[PDB]
Amino acid sequence: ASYRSTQQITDFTKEILVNRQGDLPNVVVTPNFEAGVDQVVDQLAMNDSERDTTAIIGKSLAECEALTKALKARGEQVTLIQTENRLAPGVIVVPSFLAKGLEFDAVIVWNANQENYQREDERQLLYTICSRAMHELTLVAVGSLSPLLARVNHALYTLNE
């Protein structure tokens, strides 16, 4: 409640709900799972280069496990977190439900797509996940972008930059 995100992140995230300056959130829509993982690898390298500390937030444990296995096969040091606090201050992969009470410098939202975020009732979840980012926010979607994001003003983020 003391932490606040950049205006860019605040403005993008507020529009997910139907009710500090930094980079516009970047959204990248990719054709398949392996291309999504490419973008995660690339974003981690970009964030590292700007001296960010990044968390990747996946919706569910199963999706986090699939991403984790893939990222390790890209040579990443990955910690699929089981508590907020195990190993490897390199890449944290955080299921949404474990991100409670946490804020991160940079967040990569894993697979913000239609299948994963289809329902009006899921707006609160997607909002909450994105709102964990303090300074840099990236969304990667496999297939199509979540329809919940259609309402967001296109000025508030970049798409496939």
PDB file of all heavy atoms in Angstrom, residues 39-55:
ATOM      1  N   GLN A  39      10.277 -14.956 -26.532  1.00  0.00           N
ATOM      2  CA  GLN A  39      10.082 -13.569 -26.109  1.00  0.00           C
ATOM      3  C   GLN A  39      10.401 -13.376 -24.642  1.00  0.00           C
ATOM      4  O   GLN A  39      10.920 -12.312 -24.252  1.00  0.00           O
ATOM      5  CB  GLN A  39       8.681 -13.039 -26.443  1.00  0.00           C
ATOM      6  CG  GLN A  39       8.469 -11.588 -26.002  1.00  0.00           C
ATOM      7  CD  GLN A  39       9.472 -10.574 -26.564  1.00  0.00           C
ATOM      8  OE1 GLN A  39       9.988 -10.711 -27.682  1.00  0.00           O
ATOM      9  NE2 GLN A  39       9.739  -9.529 -25.777  1.00  0.00           N
ATOM     10  N   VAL A  40      10.087 -14.368 -23.815  1.00  0.00           N
ATOM     11  CA  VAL A  40      10.455 -14.301 -22.391  1.00  0.00           C
ATOM     12  C   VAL A  40      11.993 -14.221 -22.240  1.00  0.00           C
ATOM     13  O   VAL A  40      12.523 -13.415 -21.465  1.00  0.00           O
ATOM     14  CB  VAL A  40       9.908 -15.493 -21.611  1.00  0.00           C
ATOM     15  CG1 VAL A  40      10.402 -15.465 -20.204  1.00  0.00           C
ATOM     16  CG2 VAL A  40       8.354 -15.465 -21.636  1.00  0.00           C
ATOM     17  N   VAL A  41      12.702 -15.070 -22.971  1.00  0.00           N
ATOM     18  CA  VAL A  41      14.180 -15.067 -22.916  1.00  0.00           C
ATOM     19  C   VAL A  41      14.728 -13.680 -23.301  1.00  0.00           C
ATOM     20  O   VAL A  41      15.597 -13.090 -22.620  1.00  0.00           O
ATOM     21  CB  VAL A  41      14.736 -16.166 -23.841  1.00  0.00           C
ATOM     22  CG1 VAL A  41      16.237 -16.005 -24.071  1.00  0.00           C
ATOM     23  CG2 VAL A  41      14.470 -17.539 -23.209  1.00  0.00           C
ATOM     24  N   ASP A  42      14.170 -13.148 -24.381  1.00  0.00           N
ATOM     25  CA  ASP A  42      14.575 -11.872 -24.925  1.00  0.00           C
ATOM     26  C   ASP A  42      14.268 -10.722 -23.948  1.00  0.00           C
ATOM     27  O   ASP A  42      15.123  -9.825 -23.735  1.00  0.00           O
ATOM     28  CB  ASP A  42      13.891 -11.617 -26.245  1.00  0.00           C
ATOM     29  CG  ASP A  42      14.376 -12.528 -27.338  1.00  0.00           C
ATOM     30  OD1 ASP A  42      15.296 -13.335 -27.106  1.00  0.00           O
ATOM     31  OD2 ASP A  42      13.844 -12.385 -28.466  1.00  0.00           O
ATOM     32  N   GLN A  43      13.074 -10.755 -23.354  1.00  0.00           N
ATOM     33  CA  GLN A  43      12.710  -9.739 -22.365  1.00  0.00           C
ATOM     34  C   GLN A  43      13.588  -9.796 -21.112  1.00  0.00           C
ATOM     35  O   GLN A  43      13.972  -8.770 -20.557  1.00  0.00           O
ATOM     36  CB  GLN A  43      11.233  -9.859 -21.990  1.00  0.00           C
ATOM     37  CG  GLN A  43      10.752  -8.646 -21.154  1.00  0.00           C
ATOM     38  CD  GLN A  43      10.707  -7.382 -21.974  1.00  0.00           C
ATOM     39  OE1 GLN A  43      11.207  -6.325 -21.550  1.00  0.00           O
ATOM     40  NE2 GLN A  43      10.156  -7.482 -23.157  1.00  0.00           N
ATOM     41  N   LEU A  44      13.926 -11.006 -20.679  1.00  0.00           N
ATOM     42  CA  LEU A  44      14.787 -11.157 -19.507  1.00  0.00           C
ATOM     43  C   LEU A  44      16.149 -10.533 -19.799  1.00  0.00           C
ATOM     44  O   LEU A  44      16.708  -9.830 -18.963  1.00  0.00           O
ATOM     45  CB  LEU A  44      14.925 -12.628 -19.163  1.00  0.00           C
ATOM     46  CG  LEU A  44      13.683 -13.264 -18.499  1.00  0.00           C
ATOM     47  CD1 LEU A  44      13.885 -14.750 -18.409  1.00  0.00           C
ATOM     48  CD2 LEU A  44      13.433 -12.676 -17.097  1.00  0.00           C
ATOM     49  N   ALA A  45      16.649 -10.741 -21.016  1.00  0.00           N
ATOM     50  CA  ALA A  45      17.936 -10.155 -21.416  1.00  0.00           C
ATOM     51  C   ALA A  45      17.825  -8.631 -21.451  1.00  0.00           C
ATOM     52  O   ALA A  45      18.733  -7.947 -20.983  1.00  0.00           O
ATOM     53  CB  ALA A  45      18.388 -10.705 -22.754  1.00  0.00           C
ATOM     54  N   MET A  46      16.732  -8.104 -22.013  1.00  0.00           N
ATOM     55  CA  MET A  46      16.518  -6.656 -22.052  1.00  0.00           C
ATOM     56  C   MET A  46      16.453  -6.088 -20.642  1.00  0.00           C
ATOM     57  O   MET A  46      17.152  -5.126 -20.330  1.00  0.00           O
ATOM     58  CB  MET A  46      15.242  -6.298 -22.790  1.00  0.00           C
ATOM     59  CG  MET A  46      14.906  -4.818 -22.752  1.00  0.00           C
ATOM     60  SD  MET A  46      16.206  -3.744 -23.738  1.00  0.00           S
ATOM     61  CE  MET A  46      16.125  -4.724 -25.429  1.00  0.00           C
ATOM     62  N   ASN A  47      15.619  -6.677 -19.788  1.00  0.00           N
ATOM     63  CA  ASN A  47      15.470  -6.215 -18.409  1.00  0.00           C
ATOM     64  C   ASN A  47      16.797  -6.269 -17.654  1.00  0.00           C
ATOM     65  O   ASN A  47      17.166  -5.300 -16.983  1.00  0.00           O
ATOM     66  CB  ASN A  47      14.386  -7.027 -17.678  1.00  0.00           C
ATOM     67  CG  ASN A  47      13.003  -6.744 -18.200  1.00  0.00           C
ATOM     68  OD1 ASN A  47      12.819  -5.943 -19.144  1.00  0.00           O
ATOM     69  ND2 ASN A  47      12.013  -7.419 -17.611  1.00  0.00           N
ATOM     70  N   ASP A  48      17.526  -7.378 -17.803  1.00  0.00           N
ATOM     71  CA  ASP A  48      18.867  -7.522 -17.199  1.00  0.00           C
ATOM     72  C   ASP A  48      19.786  -6.382 -17.610  1.00  0.00           C
ATOM     73  O   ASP A  48      20.554  -5.876 -16.805  1.00  0.00           O
ATOM     74  CB  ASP A  48      19.507  -8.824 -17.672  1.00  0.00           C
ATOM     75  CG  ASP A  48      18.948 -10.046 -16.990  1.00  0.00           C
ATOM     76  OD1 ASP A  48      18.098  -9.919 -16.093  1.00  0.00           O
ATOM     77  OD2 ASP A  48      19.375 -11.162 -17.370  1.00  0.00           O
ATOM     78  N   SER A  49      19.710  -5.996 -18.875  1.00  0.00           N
ATOM     79  CA  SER A  49      20.590  -4.968 -19.434  1.00  0.00           C
ATOM     80  C   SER A  49      20.303  -3.575 -18.850  1.00  0.00           C
ATOM     81  O   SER A  49      21.181  -2.671 -18.852  1.00  0.00           O
ATOM     82  CB  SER A  49      20.500  -4.978 -20.959  1.00  0.00           C
ATOM     83  OG  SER A  49      19.455  -4.151 -21.423  1.00  0.00           O
ATOM     84  N   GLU A  50      19.088  -3.412 -18.327  1.00  0.00           N
ATOM     85  CA  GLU A  50      18.658  -2.160 -17.713  1.00  0.00           C
ATOM     86  C   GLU A  50      18.748  -2.263 -16.199  1.00  0.00           C
ATOM     87  O   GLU A  50      18.344  -1.346 -15.478  1.00  0.00           O
ATOM     88  CB  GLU A  50      17.252  -1.798 -18.177  1.00  0.00           C
ATOM     89  CG  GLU A  50      17.193  -1.729 -19.698  1.00  0.00           C
ATOM     90  CD  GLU A  50      16.237  -0.676 -20.196  1.00  0.00           C
ATOM     91  OE1 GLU A  50      15.085  -0.648 -19.702  1.00  0.00           O
ATOM     92  OE2 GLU A  50      16.644   0.127 -21.076  1.00  0.00           O
ATOM     93  N   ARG A  51      19.286  -3.392 -15.741  1.00  0.00           N
ATOM     94  CA  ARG A  51      19.535  -3.670 -14.327  1.00  0.00           C
ATOM     95  C   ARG A  51      18.245  -3.808 -13.537  1.00  0.00           C
ATOM     96  O   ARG A  51      18.187  -3.453 -12.351  1.00  0.00           O
ATOM     97  CB  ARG A  51      20.468  -2.615 -13.699  1.00  0.00           C
ATOM     98  CG  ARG A  51      21.781  -2.402 -14.446  1.00  0.00           C
ATOM     99  CD  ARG A  51      22.598  -1.322 -13.768  1.00  0.00           C
ATOM    100  NE  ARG A  51      22.059   0.008 -14.068  1.00  0.00           N
ATOM    101  CZ  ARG A  51      22.710   0.957 -14.742  1.00  0.00           C
ATOM    102  NH1 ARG A  51      23.950   0.750 -15.178  1.00  0.00           N
ATOM    103  NH2 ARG A  51      22.125   2.129 -14.961  1.00  0.00           N
ATOM    104  N   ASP A  52      17.214  -4.346 -14.196  1.00  0.00           N
ATOM    105  CA  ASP A  52      15.945  -4.658 -13.539  1.00  0.00           C
ATOM    106  C   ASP A  52      16.058  -5.994 -12.841  1.00  0.00           C
ATOM    107  O   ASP A  52      16.895  -6.833 -13.218  1.00  0.00           O
ATOM    108  CB  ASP A  52      14.808  -4.788 -14.561  1.00  0.00           C
ATOM    109  CG  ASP A  52      14.515  -3.495 -15.275  1.00  0.00           C
ATOM    110  OD1 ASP A  52      14.861  -2.406 -14.735  1.00  0.00           O
ATOM    111  OD2 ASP A  52      13.944  -3.599 -16.387  1.00  0.00           O
ATOM    112  N   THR A  53      15.205  -6.185 -11.838  1.00  0.00           N
ATOM    113  CA  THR A  53      14.973  -7.502 -11.267  1.00  0.00           C
ATOM    114  C   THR A  53      13.567  -7.912 -11.693  1.00  0.00           C
ATOM    115  O   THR A  53      12.596  -7.232 -11.346  1.00  0.00           O
ATOM    116  CB  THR A  53      15.011  -7.455  -9.758  1.00  0.00           C
ATOM    117  OG1 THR A  53      16.305  -6.988  -9.330  1.00  0.00           O
ATOM    118  CG2 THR A  53      14.754  -8.853  -9.188  1.00  0.00           C
ATOM    119  N   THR A  54      13.496  -9.004 -12.448  1.00  0.00           N
ATOM    120  CA  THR A  54      12.258  -9.477 -13.048  1.00  0.00           C
ATOM    121  C   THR A  54      11.621 -10.701 -12.365  1.00  0.00           C
ATOM    122  O   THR A  54      12.342 -11.676 -12.050  1.00  0.00           O
ATOM    123  CB  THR A  54      12.498  -9.793 -14.546  1.00  0.00           C
ATOM    124  OG1 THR A  54      13.160  -8.666 -15.185  1.00  0.00           O
ATOM    125  CG2 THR A  54      11.191 -10.144 -15.218  1.00  0.00           C
ATOM    126  N   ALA A  55      10.297 -10.665 -12.158  1.00  0.00           N
ATOM    127  CA  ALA A  55       9.502 -11.876 -11.851  1.00  0.00           C
ATOM    128  C   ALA A  55       8.599 -12.214 -13.008  1.00  0.00           C
ATOM    129  O   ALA A  55       8.025 -11.315 -13.617  1.00  0.00           O
ATOM    130  CB  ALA A  55       8.678 -11.692 -10.625  1.00  0.00           C
TER     131      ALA A  55
END
